[PDB]
């Protein structure tokens, strides 16, 4: 996601974390805002443009080698690559967590695993065709982008009607009532099924699979011939935002459940 999604994803795990899980997290950030995980959700996007931060950008996203939207699939061991991937980062930097979160990498390790978790839930992170969709040019809204972009920041931008820290804080609000009692109330109680604090890998894999069914479903369904030809911020965005909404209003609450357990100490 571009800025607004990732700030809007640790907006809501804010709203769903356990106050000992809030405390862990603010020491480590140095930072007891009302902000403090949207305050640093950006993070790994800044880095991975600075030398000392290149080794990390793979780590945004799983190549899946399927075929979309005839077939989609993930595999770890295929998919991975040999420079790291979302799912290795995320056993990396949570194992940091758990191991070592007084440690001088425990802070990175925070925002990374913050921004990742986000990014598994954006579909076109989880699919390598055209480099996750960059190389599939598209028209939104009169303007020339790629398919990736769109996904990342047209769409979610256009859905909470702008791209600012305070815009993403309203959104979040609004995909947190989702959540409690309103769209996803009745299914988000299934959201964290097979959650494992012993295998990143597996957790992590589980919520990219499910990512990664919107390739198919949503994101590439209307096949090439309309994607490359259709302004997509008609009814392509109409049927993509219910999709892109749920995902990251998922992204959230998983976010919260992980950093509880990261955090989670028996009494
Ligand atoms: O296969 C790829 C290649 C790039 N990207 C993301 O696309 C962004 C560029 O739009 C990059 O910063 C990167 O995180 C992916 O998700 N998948
Ligand atoms: C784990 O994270 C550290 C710090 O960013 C990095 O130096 C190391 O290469 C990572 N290891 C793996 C296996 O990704
Ligand atoms: C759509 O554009 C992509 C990327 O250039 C290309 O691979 C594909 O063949 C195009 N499909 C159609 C039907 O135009
Ligand atoms: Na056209
Ligand atoms: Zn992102
Ligand atoms: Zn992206
Ligand atoms: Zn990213």
Same mark, same amino acid.
């Given at each position: 996601?571009?800025?607004?999604?990732? *700030?809007?994803?640790?907006?809501?795990? $804010?709203?769903?974390?356990?106050?000992?899980?809030?405390?862990?997290?603010? #020491?480590?950030?140095?930072?007891?805002?009302? !902000?403090?995980?949207?305050?640093?959700?950006?993070?790994?996007?800044?880095?991975?443009?600075?030398?000392?931060?290149?080794?990390?950008?793979?780590?945004?996203?799983?190549?899946?080698?399927?075929?979309?939207?005839?077939?989609?699939?993930?595999?770890?061991?295929?998919?991975?690559?040999?420079?790291?991937? !979302?799912?290795?980062?995320? $056993?990396?930097?949570?194992?940091?967590?758990?191991?070592?979160?007084?440690?001088?990498?425990?802070?990175?390790?925070?925002?990374?695993?913050?921004?990742?978790?986000? /990014?598994?839930?954006?579909?076109?992170?989880? *699919?390598?065709?055209?480099?996750?969709? #960059?190389?599939? /040019?598209?028209?939104?809204?009169? *303007? %020339?982008?790629?398919?990736?972009?769109?996904?990342?920041?047209?769409?979610?931008? *256009?859905?909470?009607?702008?791209?600012?820290?305070?815009?993403?804080?309203?959104?979040?609000?609004?995909?947190?009532?989702?959540?409690?009692?309103? %769209?996803?109330?009745?299914?988000?109680?299934?959201?964290?099924?097979?959650? /494992?604090?012993?295998?990143?890998?597996?957790? !992590?894999?589980?919520?990219?699979?499910?990512?990664?069914?919107?390739?198919?479903?949503?994101?590439?369904?209307?096949?090439?011939?309309?994607?490359?030809?259709? /302004?997509?911020?008609?009814?392509?965005? +109409?049927?993509? $935002?219910?999709?892109?909404?749920?995902?990251?209003?998922?992204?959230?609450?998983?976010?919260?459940?992980?950093? +509880?357990?990261?955090? !989670? $100490?028996?009494?």
């Amino acid at each position: 996601w571009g800025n607004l999604g990732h *700030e809007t994803v640790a907006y809501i795990a $804010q709203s769903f974390v356990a106050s000992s899980t809030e405390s862990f997290c603010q #020491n480590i950030l140095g930072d007891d805002s009302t !902000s403090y995980l949207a305050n640093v959700a950006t993070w790994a996007d800044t880095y991975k443009y600075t030398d000392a931060g290149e080794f990390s950008k793979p780590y945004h996203f799983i190549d899946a080698q399927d075929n979309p939207p005839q077939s989609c699939g993930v595999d770890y061991d295929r998919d991975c690559g040999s420079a790291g991937c !979302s799912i290795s980062a995320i $056993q990396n930097y949570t194992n940091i967590l758990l191991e070592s979160p007084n440690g001088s990498e425990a802070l990175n390790a925070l925002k990374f695993v913050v921004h990742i978790i986000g /990014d598994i839930h954006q579909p076109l992170h989880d *699919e390598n065709l055209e480099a996750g969709g #960059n190389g599939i /040019d598209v028209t939104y809204d009169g *303007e %020339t982008t790629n398919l990736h972009h769109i996904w990342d920041t047209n769409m979610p931008e *256009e859905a909470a009607g702008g791209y600012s820290l305070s815009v993403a804080k309203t959104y979040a609000d609004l995909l947190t009532e989702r959540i409690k009692t309103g %769209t996803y109330s009745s299914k988000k109680d299934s959201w964290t099924d097979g959650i /494992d604090i012993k295998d990143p890998v597996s957790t !992590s894999m589980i919520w990219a699979a499910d990512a990664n069914t919107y390739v198919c479903s949503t994101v590439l369904d209307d096949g090439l011939a309309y994607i490359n030809s259709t /302004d997509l911020s008609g009814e392509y965005y +109409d049927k993509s $935002q219910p999709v892109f909404e749920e995902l990251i209003a998922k992204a959230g609450y998983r976010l919260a459940a992980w950093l +509880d357990l990261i955090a !989670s $100490q028996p009494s």
